[PDB]
Amino acid sequence: DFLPLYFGWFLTKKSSETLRKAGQVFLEELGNHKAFKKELRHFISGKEKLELVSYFGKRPPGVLHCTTKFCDYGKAAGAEEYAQQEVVKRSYGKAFKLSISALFVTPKTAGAQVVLTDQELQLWPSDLDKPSASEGLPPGSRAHVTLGCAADVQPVQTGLDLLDILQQVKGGSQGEAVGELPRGKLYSLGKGRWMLSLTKKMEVKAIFTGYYG
Known about the structure:
monomeric; nervous system; monomer; 2', 3'-cyclic nucleotide 3'-phosphodiesterase; alpha+beta; 27% helix; hydrolase; myelin
């Protein structure tokens, strides 16, 4: 009896359209921003302008999601232990509201930061060999929605990318906002990394369930 490929919160059609459009507008605004344009060298080693919607060409086709535990049908470490928790079984098929606090972009991925409630944090995995990228950071900090990936990148990168962006804000290194977009303040973390802090947290609805490929 096998597990899904992964468990996660799957956004409603409506919420996915909303966040998807938010991400795309952000990519069109970021790519046109003069602060971004003057840093293109720290972005692509390739003078004309980069179109980020095109740059992030591998995108989710339909509904968006926030992954909790990648299971690979039970091949992944901790997959069974995770799937067996009462809270997971109990939460299966239930609606949740997810709060997105920021949109981000690196040379590798574009995504949205999810800020989990403590209830939702109960559905966040407690891995038995923790990532040194994750470590130092409050649990669930890795929670995100993938918006796009560059050609050579696997969408699991997005999470590592977000933890990286946050490792720096932990060291108070985000620095001074270099711009004001209609939705929030634009931060340049360097190394091709960008973060938009939303003035107002987007709220999205999603169903907690398992995806089987």
